[PDB]
Amino acid sequence: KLSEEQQHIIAILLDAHHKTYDPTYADFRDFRPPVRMSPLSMLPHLADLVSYSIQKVIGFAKMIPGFRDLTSDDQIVLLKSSAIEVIMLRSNQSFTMDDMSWDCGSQDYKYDVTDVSKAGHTLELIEPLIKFQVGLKKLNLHEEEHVLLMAICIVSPDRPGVQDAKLVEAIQDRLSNTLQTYIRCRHPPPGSHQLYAKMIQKLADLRSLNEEHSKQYRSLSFQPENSMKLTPLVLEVFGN
Amino acid sequence: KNHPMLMNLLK
Numbered sequence: 001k002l003s004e005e006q007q008h009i010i011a012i013l014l015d016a017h018h019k020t021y022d023p024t025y026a027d028f029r030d031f032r033p034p035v036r037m038s039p040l041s042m043l044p045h046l047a048d049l050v051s052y053s054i055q056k057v058i059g060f061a062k063m064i065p066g067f068r069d070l071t072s073d074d075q076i077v078l079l080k081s082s083a084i085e086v087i088m089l090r091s092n093q094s095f096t097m098d099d100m101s102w103d104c105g106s107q108d109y110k111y112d113v114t115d116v117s118k119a120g121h122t123l124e125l126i127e128p129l130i131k132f133q134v135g136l137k138k139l140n141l142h143e144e145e146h147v148l149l150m151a152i153c154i155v156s157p158d159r160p161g162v163q164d165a166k167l168v169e170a171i172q173d174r175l176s177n178t179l180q181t182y183i184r185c186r187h188p189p190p191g192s193h194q195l196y197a198k199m200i201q202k203l204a205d206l207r208s209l210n211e212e213h214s215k216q217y218r219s220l221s222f223q224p225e226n227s228m229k230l231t232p233l234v235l236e237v238f239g240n
Numbered sequence: 241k242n243h244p245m246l247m248n249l250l251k
């Protein structure tokens with residue numbers, strides 16, 4: 001059932017994730033310092049964290065089978081629209097349900113709901129974001145399923161501004177069929193029950209999170225004093 | 241309108 005091409009796709013995506021996600025979190029020392037001790041005291045650190053993660057998301061995307069066959073315009077449209085969603089998905093690796101926080105190896109780099117609020121965001125975003133992290137963690141995805149879901153998210157044909165929607169759809173369909181076949185062949189029950197449908201629900205959840213994050217980002221970044229604390233990459237990708 | 245940093249990271 002899982003064809004050799006489908007096994008190849010999975011192998012490429014696992015390798016791409018290993019090359020672009022560093023679970024030692026060594027580079028966090030390079031970011032502006034978190035300040036917790038109201039002002040948006042965590043904005044400099046979290047802007048650097050987000051900017052670093054965007055770079056890793058682009059590096060992963062470039063390795064998705066078929067992504068490089070798209071025009072530069074379409075690659076750009078797809079990364080601009082999906083980067084926020086892929087950041088939410090990939091951060092699930094460091095999320096822990098012990099205290100509902102993102103634990104990146106040390107106390108300095110352990111982030112909770114208060115840290116997100118100290119970058120300027122409100123419960124309108126943060127409450128659904130925690131519910132998403134919990135629901136995704138509860139799916140107990142195989143790493144194979146986690147990397148396929150990130151790839152499917154990036155290569156979405158309904159993103160605004162997509163030109164060659166039929167080619168985007170053809171690439172995504174190959175990934176979607178790989179995931180559906182992987183679940184049926186390699187994920188034992190009961191964990192596999194309705195798993196594909198539950199993963200696609202997480203993609204719909206991400207669209208809602210994207211819409212809210214974009215609304216609040218627009219309000220935050222409209223104030224020039226906040227935009228001054230962002231990075232050039234964040235301004236280019238999330239908007240200026 | 242131009243995305244030079246993204247374009248550059250995209251090769």
Ligand SMILES: CCC[Si@](C)(c1ccc(OC[C@@H](O)CCC(=O)O)c(C)c1)c1ccc(OCC(O)(CC)CC)c(C)c1
Nearest residue numbers: 020021046047049050053056090091102111115116119220
């Ligand atoms: C409080 C943290 C909760 Si967040 C889900 C997070 C957690 C762990 C992370 O990283 C984990 C690992 O994945 C990194 C390794 C890798 O990806 O390779 C990352 C990237 C993010 C978060 C916070 C702030 C924010 O935006 C603020 C903004 O809108 C202010 C204007 C834009 C600047 C965003 C978009 C997201």
